[PDB]
């Protein structure tokens, strides 16, 4: 009844576990990184990481360890899913095709059992005799490893100790022994068991039950010859080996808790340790006692190698290179030149992988192109929080720069034997034309003998017959190749100035006034072939190849496109293209894998058309609005097939994917004229020039999202956009320590201590207050700021710091009431540790004027303002449990208008029109309507279902979307039936889906251009969402017939496509919860449908063996495997 369609416009980026081994080949050193579902296999080389494969698994990688069972060459890969799907994958490549086959697959869930709060632990015997798994408390599930165990048949073993923290398998033992730390009322102990597969029960461990620190965090099993185990907590590392027991309490690991570890030596003599605050230690084992050949520990020194990103999974590659994979920071590659000591730190960063981190709030802003949105997200946390600006455009990597005096056209000229290289490019100045010759990166301009020195040459291409033609307004000069001297002059009989000249491989047309002349290039000579007259002046002309069967001309006096015979004077067709302005560029292109000719008007708009190579002209009326500036369309050889670059205020690149063109915006401010140049200096480049200067570089493939990061060294919490002020407003938090002198001290220079105009909130509306439990030494205190960040330079213009013990929660920019100016309205909450639920808060209204953040209004409320939105000029606040509506008076003071008291906590406010949607963490979705006649809220609907809800959004007047526990997405719907005046008060739940991600933020908008297309698209609307792992999604509705077609096609693809681990799709996407599981409905997996363009045509045939395809008809043929390509290609453009 909803008919949605959910797709992912950016794969997840937060690394949640990485592991190195010999996976792809017996000699390679791989590196596998799991994100949630994105298992990325890199091969470690000398310079860094060379990606090799990237496979999408149908689950959240919760366990991943490479093991090599005896009798195999390269390692296998055991992967467990958060839905308890266990698979053993093997790498398999056949020359060029790479496949991840599955050697065993099963589901290792139990029918009953509360999952362990410490989470899944997946550990493996060093001898590859078994795989232990802790899923539920007091139960250790052992998987034997046999060649005939293709279903992974596991058995449980009871654990007498319920609260197990960390468990591992020891080294150098006959039977497989496990050692683990467990919590009992006495304290924390470490115990070892032996596991026998025959008996299927635990035995007596090698050691005895010892006693360890009350906060001993984790166990790490030391290899032979050391053996034993190392247990590290917060103040001591203790090594146990039965009769041996070493304990160290170093004074450097006191500040933070070690959370991650790795081993850098094969013999286990040094270990890497990372803690919460992003600091990299190194545990050194001293084996200086070789008393009887064996090796025993003597000392346990802990070094300190410096500071890195906030680590989540260390990994030591070869040659002192460490991959400090970060879950909330950004993945790194630090080099441990432990002899550097540049400033005391032995780590130096090498690379940095993009990580959109915990997206906590986003906003869509029309910043520059005014046609396409740009997403701005508050990414990261703690010392690596930042702002990411995400834009959808074909990126251009510029490698060369040069300054030109407003050059308005360039052309490569070759004056050498043919070597696919041009040693010079002629640029068209205002009056002259200076050609720059650059064997390397030269900038000097050299006048060609065969080209006019100062005549403002217009066309200078690679003419045929081993000649170079430099056609100008005065006369056309053709020079030879080897002689390099003027060998032909083709002057007009009237000696007039040709406005626009068309050049081809061997035929050249010169248009003067309303007359045109066509000539054919001859060896060392120029011969005029024909002349013709036109009704109106020829503003532009270009014949695309040889001999062109047709010639296109734009009438200056009529603004119409006329196609005729290029080697003759016979007209073929004509079309008046609007007539608003004279067209500035007309060309014919083969980028559509066919013959097509499109012309660009002077206003930037291009009317599409489809030409015929042999004979025939069409119209194909279709408007593309490139911008509001003249455009000179060109083509570059360094392309897929041809491409078409349209230089303007908003440059575009037109490329055809299957049967329709796509105009991808370029990543540049504005370009005046571009030309291909596949020269030695920059192979496969495209030299572009603008009103300022010129540059050269390469162009990316297509439509890849580009992310610009702006660091803050703080935790950003919220963000809005104020259009009039051209600036952003972002709440941020900085952590400070309690100082001995009385006050708070900052750890590092953040982005709020380094603002231009830093103020401090002094509007102590209340006074006195209470704090009998005053903060002591060393405690951490969060200090909040409102930052006013610019929209162009992205610098903080103001950092207004709020009061003490004041958590600033919400933030809205709007024009309240009838005021002509905008405001920043921030709702805060005074939180003291003694009090549990805050009782005091504020709604402070700032106004950023003239570079100063002045507090305009003020208001005190008896609670915490959790959320705020705007009605039509009236603020709508949520104070604890009540929803209040504030009307902005003329005297600049918020005035209450109406109240609505809830039994729930009004924690999510989302509105449209007059409908208000109120929610809380317990998924108590509630609806309200504003009655203008009465002024008071009326409760229209209600939906109560106890479960943890993460976000909420309005899709329409009817559908209300939201997120829900265990990473699910749901969609409610109101009305219908209207049976007993009580069903209209209830919200039917129509859509369910297992997204697999924790959605933080929902926001309307889309990242594609607004080409209307008259008929529009089947998908109506677009709702982006942002999650913890760092993916951007997109939910868009669908018509019912489209939903039926795509659901049937989904069921058909499930039988053809092969998953990794052989997880059936419908089980991955089932609405998963700890107590019940129901199939997905009302949601279409965008990734699965868009995968229809990856499978082969032979595989595509049986996907569509017997289908309907509708399309204004019945069941025409079987969709022919081309109608559905059109459908999926249309669906791809949305994200």
Question: Is the CB of 231 or the CB of 1008 nearer to another protein?
Answer: 231
- Does 365 sit near another protein (CB under 8 A)? no
**What are φ and ψ of residue 910, in 5° steps?**
-140, 130
Residue reference for tokens 């213009």: 797
Q: Is 81 in the site for another protein (CB under 8 A)?
A: no
- Could you give the CA distance from residue 624 to residue 645 in angstroms, rounded to a whole number? 14
Binding residue (CB under 8 A) for another protein from 109, 257, 822, 988: 257
79 binds another protein, rule: CB under 8 A: no
DSSP secondary structure letter of residue 170: P
948 binds another protein (CB under 8 A): yes
Among 65, 125, 312, 445, binds another protein (CB under 8 A): 312
Q: Quote the least distance from Cβ 425 to another protein, whole Å.
A: 52
**Could you say whether residue 830 binds another protein (CB under 8 A)?**
no
Instruction: Check binding of 367 to another protein (CB under 8 A).
Output: no
Measured from the CB atom, the residue of 774 and 891 that comes closer to another protein is 774
**Which of these ranges, 158-166, 458-466, 701-709, 976-984, lies near another protein under the rule CB under 8 A?**
158-166
Residue of 306, 278, 280, 254 whose CA lies nearest to 380 = 278
> In the set 577, 601, 831, 1131, which binds another protein (CB under 8 A)?
831
In DSSP terms, 915 is beta-bridged to 912, 929
Torsion over CA: 216, 219, 223, 228 (sign): positive
- H or E element: which one contains 883? strand 882-888
Q: In the bound complex, what is the minimum distance in angstroms from residue 378's beta carbon to another protein?
A: 9
For position 1033 contacting another protein by CB under 8 A, the verdict is no
Span interacting with another protein, options 150-158, 203-211, 292-300, 826-834, rule CB under 8 A: 826-834
Phi then psi for 1050, rounded to 5 degrees? Answer: -65, -45
| Candidate residues 530, 693, 965, 1101; the one interacting with another protein per rule CB under 8 A | 965
3-state secondary structure of 1014: coil
- The reply to whether 328 sits near another protein by the rule CB under 8 A is yes
Among 95, 742, 946, 1013, binds another protein (CB under 8 A): 946
* Residue 836 binds another protein (CB under 8 A): yes
State whether residue 433 is helix, strand or coil: coil
Q: Does position 874 bind another protein by CB under 8 A? A: no
Identify whether the C-beta of residue 253 lies closer than 8 Å to the C-beta of residue 234. Answer: yes
Task: Give the shortest CB-945-to-another protein separation in angstroms.
Answer: 9
CA distance linking residue 355 with residue 385, whole number of Å: 11
CB 508 within 8 A of CB 521: yes
* Residue selected from 52, 248, 259, 400 as contacting another protein according to rule CB under 8 A: 259
- Give least dist CB 266 to another protein, A: 24
- Return the closest-CA partner of residue 991 out of 947, 1045, 946, 1038: 1038
With binding defined as CB under 8 A, does residue 838 bind another protein?
Answer: yes
Q: Is 437 in the site for another protein (CB under 8 A)?
A: no
Judged by CB under 8 A, which of 9, 18, 237, 313 binds another protein? 313
Query: Rounded distance, CA 781 to CA 331, Å?
Result: 28
Q: What is the Cα–Cα distance from 354 to 379, expressed in whole angstroms? A: 11
Helices and strands (DSSP H and E) totals, the chain: 5, 87
Note if the bond before 819 is cis, omega within 30 degrees: no
H/E stretch holding 1103: helix 1097-1103
Helix pair 1040-1056, 1123-1132: axis angle to 10 deg: 110
Q: Is 189 in the site for another protein (CB under 8 A)?
A: no
> Does residue 1000 touch another protein according to CB under 8 A?
yes
Q: Is 431 in the site for another protein (CB under 8 A)?
A: no
Binding mask 268-307 for another protein (x = CB under 8 A): --------x-------------------------------
- Quick one: CA dihedral 901, 907, 909, 910, positive or negative? negative
Q: Does 215 bind another protein (CB under 8 A)?
A: yes
Q: Binding another protein by CB under 8 A: which of 109, 149, 183, 753?
A: 183
Binding flag, residue 111, another protein (CB under 8 A): no
Helical H segments across 184-224, by residue range: none
DSSP secondary structure code for residue 789 in this structure: E
Q: Is 163 in the site for another protein (CB under 8 A)?
A: yes
Is 119 one of the binding residues for another protein (CB under 8 A)? yes
CB 627 to another protein: min, Å: 37
Of 33 and 413, which has the nearer Cβ to another protein?
33
Q: Per CB under 8 A, does 1025 bind another protein?
A: no
Binding region for another protein (CB under 8 A) out of 92-100, 423-431, 444-452, 827-835: 827-835
The least CB distance from residue 242 to another protein, in Å, is 24
913 binds another protein (CB under 8 A): no
Among the residue ranges 124-132, 214-222, 346-354, 740-748, the one whose residues contact another protein (CB under 8 A): 214-222
Whole-angstrom Cα distance, residue 641 to residue 635? 10
Residue ranges of E strands in 630-684: 632-634, 644-647, 652-656, 661-665, 673-677
Q: Are 666 and 639 in contact (CB under 8 A)?
A: no
- The residue (of 263 and 327) whose beta carbon lies closer to another protein is 327
CA–CA distance, 657 with 701 (Å, rounded to integer): 12
Told to check if 1028 binds another protein by CB under 8 A, we report yes
Residue number with CB closer to another protein (393 or 919): 919
Return the number of the residue (811 or 972) whose C-beta is nearest another protein: 811
Residue 472 structure tokens: 């100008």
Give least dist CB 733 to another protein, A. 8
Cβ proximity to another protein, 606 vs 909, nearer residue: 909
Could you tell me the smallest distance in angstroms from the CB atom of residue 357 to another protein?
A: 8
Where on the phi/psi map is residue 713: left (φ > 0), alpha (ψ -120 to 50), or beta? Answer: left
Q: What are phi and psi for residue 1087, nearest 5 degrees? A: -65, -45
- Report which of 802, 785, 709 is spatially closest to residue 750, judged by C-alpha positions: 785
For residues 100 and 254, what is the distance between their CA atoms, to the nearest angstrom? 44
Please, which residue, 459 or 1002, has the CB nearer to another protein? 1002
Nearest to 1002 by CA among 933, 919, 936: 919
The window from 183-191, 295-303, 490-498, 536-544 that contacts another protein (CB under 8 A) reads: 183-191
- Identified binder of another protein from the candidate list 129, 191, 327, 595, rule CB under 8 A: 327
Q: Output 696 or 811, the one with its CB closest to another protein.
A: 811
Please give the structure tokens belonging to residue 141.
């599930």
- The answer to the question of residue 781 lying near another protein (CB under 8 A) is no
**What is the distance between the alpha carbons of residues 321 and 572, in angstroms, rounded to a whole number?**
68
Strand order, beta sheet including 673-677: 396-402, 694-699, 685-689, 673-677
Instruction: Please list, residue by residue across 450-488, b when 16 or more beta carbons sit within 10 angstroms of its beta carbon and e when fewer do.
Output: bbbeebbbbbbbebbbebbbbbbbbbbbbbbbeeeebbb
Verify binding: residue 715, another protein, rule CB under 8 A: yes
Min. distance of Cβ 94 from another protein in angstroms?
A: 35
What number of residues does the chain have? 1135
Tokens 């108590």 label which residue?
924
Give yes or no for residue 891 binding another protein (CB under 8 A). Answer: no
**Per rule CB under 8 A, is residue 804 in the interface with another protein?**
no
Residue 358 found at the interface with another protein (CB under 8 A): yes
- Residue ranges in contact with another protein by CB under 8 A: 16-17, 62, 115, 117-119, 163, 165-166, 183, 185, 187-188, 214-215, 217-218, 257, 259-260, 276, 312-313, 327-328, 358, 360-361, 381-382, 715, 717-718, 773, 780, 807, 809, 831, 833-834, 836-838, 921-922, 946-948, 950, 965-967, 998, 1000-1001, 1028, 1074-1075
């Amino acid at each position: 009844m909803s008919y949605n369609y959910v797709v992912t416009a950016q794969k997840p980026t937060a690394v949640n576990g990485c592991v190195t081994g010999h996976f792809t080949s017996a000699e390679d050193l791989n590196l596998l990184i799991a994100k949630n579902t994105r298992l990325e296999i890199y091969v470690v080389t000398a310079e860094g990481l060379r990606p090799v494969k990237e496979v999408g698994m149908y689950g959240k990688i919760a366990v991943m360890e490479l093991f090599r069972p005896k009798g195999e060459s390269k390692d296998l890969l055991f992967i467990l899913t958060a839905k308890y799907n266990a698979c053993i994958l093997e790498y398999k490549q056949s020359g060029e095709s790479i496949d991840i086959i599955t050697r065993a697959h099963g589901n290792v869930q139990d029918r009953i059992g509360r999952p362990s709060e410490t989470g899944i632990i997946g550990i493996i015997d060093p001898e590859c005799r078994m795989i232990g798994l802790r899923l539920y408390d007091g139960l250790f599930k052992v998987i034997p490893l046999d060649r005939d165990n293709k279903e992974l048949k596991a058995f449980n073993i009871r654990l007498e100790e319920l609260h197990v923290i960390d468990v591992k398998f020891l080294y150098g033992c006959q039977a497989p022994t496990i050692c683990f730390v467990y919590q009992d009322p006495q304290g924390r102990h470490v115990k070892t068991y032996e596991v026998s597969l025959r008996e299927k029960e635990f035995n007596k461990g090698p050691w005895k039950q010892e006693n360890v620190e009350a906060e001993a965090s984790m166990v790490i099993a030391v290899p032979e010859p050391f053996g034993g185990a190392i247990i590290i907590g917060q103040e001591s590392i203790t090594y146990h080996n039965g009769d041996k027991y070493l304990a160290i309490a170093p004074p450097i690991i006191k500040q933070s808790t070690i959370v991650c570890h790795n081993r850098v030596d094969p013999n286990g003599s040094r270990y890497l340790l990372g803690d919460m605050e992003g600091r990299l230690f190194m545990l050194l084992l001293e084996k200086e006692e070789q008393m009887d050949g064996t090796v025993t520990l003597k000392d346990l020194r802990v070094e300190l190698l410096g500071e890195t990103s906030i680590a989540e999974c260390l990994t030591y590659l070869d040659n002192g290179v460490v991959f400090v994979g970060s879950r909330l920071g950004d993945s790194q590659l630090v080099k441990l030149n432990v002899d550097s000591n540049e400033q005391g730190s032995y780590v130096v960063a090498m690379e940095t992988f993009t990580n959109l981190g915990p997206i906590v709030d986003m906003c869509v802003v029309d910043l520059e192109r005014q046609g396409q949105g740009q997403l701005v997200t508050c990414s990261g946390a703690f010392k690596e929080g930042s702002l990411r600006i995400i834009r959808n455009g074909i990126g251009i990597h510029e490698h060369a720069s040069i300054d030109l005096p407003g050059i308005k056209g360039l052309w490569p000229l070759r004056s050498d034997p043919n070597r696919e290289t041009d040693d010079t490019l002629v640029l068209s100045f205002v009056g002259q034309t200076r050609v720059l010759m650059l064997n390397g990166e030269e900038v000097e301009e050299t006048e060609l003998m065969g080209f006019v020195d100062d005549q403002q040459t217009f066309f200078c291409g690679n003419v045929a017959h081993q000649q170079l033609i430099q056609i100008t307004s005065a006369s056309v000069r053709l020079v030879s190749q080897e002689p390099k001297a003027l060998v032909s002059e083709w002057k007009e009989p009237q000696a007039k100035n040709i406005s626009v000249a068309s050049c081809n491989s061997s035929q050249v047309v010169v248009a003067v006034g309303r007359a045109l002349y066509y000539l054919q290039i001859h060896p060392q000579e120029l011969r005029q072939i024909s002349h013709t007259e036109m009704e109106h002046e020829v503003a532009c002309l270009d014949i695309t190849p040889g001999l062109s069967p047709l010639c296109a001309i734009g009438l200056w006096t009529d603004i119409s496109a006329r196609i005729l015979k290029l080697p003759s004077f016979e007209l073929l067709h004509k079309e008046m293209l609007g007539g608003e302005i004279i067209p500035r560029s007309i060309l014919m292109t083969t980028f559509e894998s066919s013959h097509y000719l499109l012309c660009a008007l002077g206003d930037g708009a291009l009317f599409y058309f489809g030409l015929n190579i042999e004979t025939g002209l069409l119209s194909d009326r279709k408007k593309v609005t490139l911008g509001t500036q003249p455009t000179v369309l060109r083509t570059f050889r360094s392309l897929s097939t041809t491409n078409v670059f349209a230089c303007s205020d908003r440059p575009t690149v037109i490329y055809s994917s299957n049967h329709k063109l796509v105009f991808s915006n370029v990543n540049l401010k504005e370009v005046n004229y571009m030309c291909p140049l596949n020269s030695d200096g920059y192979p496969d480049s495209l030299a572009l020039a603008n009103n300022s200067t010129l540059t050269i570089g390469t162009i990316d493939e297509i439509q890849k999202l580009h992310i610009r990061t702006v660091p803050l060294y703080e935790s950003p919490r919220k963000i809005c956009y104020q259009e009039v002020s051209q600036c952003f407003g972002v709440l941020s938090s900085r952590i400070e320590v309690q100082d001995t002198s009385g006050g708070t001290t900052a750890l590092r220079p953040s982005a709020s201590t380094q603002a231009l105009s830093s103020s401090v909130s002094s509007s102590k509306l209340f006074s006195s207050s209470t704090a009998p439990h005053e903060t002591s030494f060393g405690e951490e205190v969060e200090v909040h700021n409102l930052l006013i960040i610019d929209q162009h330079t992205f610098e903080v213009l103001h950092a207004h710091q709020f009061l003490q013990n004041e958590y600033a929660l919400s933030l809205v920019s709007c024009k309240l009431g009838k005021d002509p100016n905008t405001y920043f309205i921030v709702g805060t909450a005074m939180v003291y540790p003694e009090e549990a639920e805050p009782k005091q808060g504020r709604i402070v209204v700032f106004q950023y004027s003239d570079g100063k953040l002045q507090t305009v209004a003020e208001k005190e409320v008896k609670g915490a303002v959790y959320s705020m939105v705007e009605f039509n000029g009236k603020l709508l606040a949520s104070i604890n449990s009540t929803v209040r509506l504030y009307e902005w008076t003329t005297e600049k003071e918020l005035r209450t208008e109406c109240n609505h008291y809830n039994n729930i906590m009004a924690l999510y406010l989302k509105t449209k029109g007059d409908f208000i949607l109120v929610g809380d963490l317990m998924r108590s979705v509630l609806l309200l309507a504003y009655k203008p006649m009465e002024g008071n809220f009326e409760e229209i609907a209600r939906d109560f279902n106890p479960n943890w809800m993460s976000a909420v959004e309005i899709l329409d007047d009817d559908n209300f979307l939201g997120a829900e526990n265990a990473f699910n997405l749901f969609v409610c719907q109101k009305d219908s039936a209207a049976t007993t005046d009580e069903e209209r008060q209830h919200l039917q739940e129509v859509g369910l889906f297992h997204l697999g991600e924790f959605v933080n933020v929902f926001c309307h908008g889309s990242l594609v251009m607004q080409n209307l297309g008259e008929t529009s698209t089947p998908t109506q609307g677009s709702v982006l969402f942002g999650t913890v792992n760092g993916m951007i999604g997109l939910v868009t509705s669908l018509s019912e017939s489209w939903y039926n077609l795509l659901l049937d096609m989904q069921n058909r693809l499930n039988k053809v496509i092969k998953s990794v681990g052989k997880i059936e799709h419908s089980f991955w996407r089932s609405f998963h919860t700890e107590r019940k599981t129901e199939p997905a409905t009302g949601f279409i997996d965008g990734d699965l449908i868009e995968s229809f363009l990856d499978i082969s045509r032979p595989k595509m045939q049986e996907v569509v063996a017997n289908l309907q395809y509708d399309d204004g008809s019945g069941m025409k043929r079987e969709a022919t495997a081309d109608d559905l390509i059109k459908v999926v290609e249309e669906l791809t453009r949305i994200h």
